[PDB]
Ligand SMILES: NC(=[NH2+])NCCC[C@H](N)C(=O)O
């Protein structure tokens with residue numbers, strides 16, 4: 001009856017939220033392995049509290065430091081280091097679910113290893129579907145793995161869909177289950193009400209407005225929503241007709257689904273990742289998450305805007321890239337990482353982010369079976385091109 | 395494949411919405427019988443268009459006029475009259491579903507007959523659960539009938555609940571399916587922002603701002619009180635599991651709060667074809683002739699907390715709910731009389747609650763129910779309400 005978990009990415013906020021849910025439900029969930037790619041100090045404190053069978057650092061030098069610490073703080077925890085070790089804890093025979101919350105391309109291989117092992121995948125890595133969506137959906141079908149999305153918007157959509165679609169992510173025909181379209185919602189970022197002409201003079205200070213700066217700039221360009229759009233396409237097998245973006249500045253509603261009869265289902269809640277995580281752990285049942293019920297006294301007004309592509313050119317690029325396929329979305333994601341770093345380094349203007357993305361995307365896709373290796377190679381090629389366009393713009 | 399329907403109450407707006415959905419889906423639904431009260435002109439036009447096997451008027455004189463009209467225009471339609479005939483078309487062997495949209499206490503007996511026949515019941519009669527909830531839920535269990543609520547709020551709640559609950563209405567333990575509570579929403583009516591002191595002087599013109607009884611009930615929030623009582627019986631909700639929220643714009647139709655912090659809400663254009671369509675198609679979905687919700691034109695959504703100084707009727711309904719069938723039957727009956735008196739300008743708007751309150755107290759100080767015995771109680775309560783209306787006048 002007990003569900004056994006490996007947590008990939010235990011020292012971040014997703015890891016923390018996952019552990020809070022497990023803390024509320026000690027009779028249902030048990031932590032077999034914890035793994036991290038940063039923060040040995042946090043990791044040793046978590047291994048002390050959780051005493052897991054395995055603890056893994058992605059970096060081998062960091063694993064050595066952890067092993068020395070846990071010789072005192074968690075003597076029965078076996079510490080391991082490296083990429084092979086991440087795959088090892090992700091594929092253990094006794095493990096039922098894997099929280100895949102290591103970010104970036106470093107998360108692909110261990111997430112993929114869990115997929116090939118037929119595990120239940122609590123998906124909190126954007127790159128798996130942005131870079132290699134077709135590949136991931138195929139491997140999931142091949143092994144019988146269950147995919148359950150962690151991210152707020154995707155999780156909300158998941159909850160607003162019928163059970164037949166929930167059980168068969170990536171392979172169901174939406175129109176045959178009565179779905180007209182999915183409404184992906186977003187706040188619109190700090191420049192939601194800013195005149196388009198003023199965007200040229202925007203500074204990194206303004207674009208940050210609390211989480212990491214790359215994620216904040218993506219929120220300002222709505223590239224964050226673009227990437228979510230791409231993931232939604234693969235998660236829910238949605239065509240461009242079936243997938244819409246709506247700006248909802250207050251973020252109380254997390255996303256919605258429009259049905260054929262006129263009915264709309266929406267998911268709402270307090271802004272706490274423990275809620276969506278809790279469902280990924282408990283599906284199809286539900287568990288206490290340590291999150292209070294929504295307080296309609298404090299919600300204030302809910303409003304909606306149509307995104308303007310003059311304001312959010314990156315969003316148009318992501319939608320376009322989406323339906324061109326893996327090569328285009330890998331290219332766009334790579335280019336954007338370079339373009340954002342250049343804006344933050346004050347080499348290019350805020351509005352140049354979209355121009356860099358647009359140039360690189362056009363160059364790559366005018367040319368004519370994919371693997372994780374070949375797509376990483378393409379990621380690298382796109383970065384090189386983006387570096388060159390950054391110089392043109394500087 | 396084809397679902398066969400009897401429509402009780404075909405000439406009203408619910409009947410019209412049902413027929414619009416059937417019109418969109420001729421490969422899935424077929425009309426076996428249509429039934430109505432005494433709008434013979436609308437009924438003959440519908441029997442012309444639909445050519446059903448049976449057509450029934452509740453009034454026998456009206457049935458005779460219809461029978462003469464249809465003898466050429468709908469030659470294959472057998473016309474019948476009276477209460478027994480309503481029960482007959484509601485219980486036909488070939489019929490799968492019954493739209494129970496005859497309103498008031500007259501709807502109880504034929505709706506109940508459909509229930510005892512084990513039919514799928516598309517419930518659009520408030521009285522079945524307000525007056526005789528215990529009795530209906532028991533009879534539904536006994537026969538294996540499916541109950542699917544037509545009314546907007548209940549239908550919304552139904553859609554926001556898990557599938558395991560949807561398949562067992564009136565008998566599922568909500569907490570065991572992860573539900574903390576149901577959030578029954580309402581507009582708050584035309585006086586949502588009005589000072590309590592000003593309610594004494596409101597006139598029927600102001601209370602109407604859609605039949606007039608339903609509008610006044612919307613102004614007092616008795617509408618929400620009645621819906622509260624029905625929800626309790628439909629979803630088997632305890633006093634912890636059922637809440638009321640004011641949402642003035644009525645875009646959100648109701649919501650459900652789950653154990654993990656997640657809330658599901660149902661929204662849509664204000665068109666009864668949507669909820670009706672789901673009652674017909676469940677667990678699948680069908681085209682309903684309703685456009686998708688346009689979020690560019692929705693405007694702002696807000697929420698308020700009801701005040702019992704502003705909505706005394708809502709407190710009465712909740713109170714009556716947990717006192718049982720006798721109390722809810724009494725309150726409903728009293729309120730029908732009290733609203734008619736307000737509309738006739740015999741009593742003040744704020745006297746509606748006072749009449750309801752007096753009658754409810756009088757009846758429940760005194761001490762196996764049937765439809766007959768509860769109808770008698772309905773009549774006794776009306777008599778008392780008439781007397782309190784004179785005191786107030
Ligand atoms: N977190 C990191 N940047 N790790 C890089 C180190 C790679 C690791 N030592 C290995 O050989 O598998």
Ligand SMILES: [Cl-]
Pocket residue numbers: 185186187188224
């Ligand atoms: Cl967002």
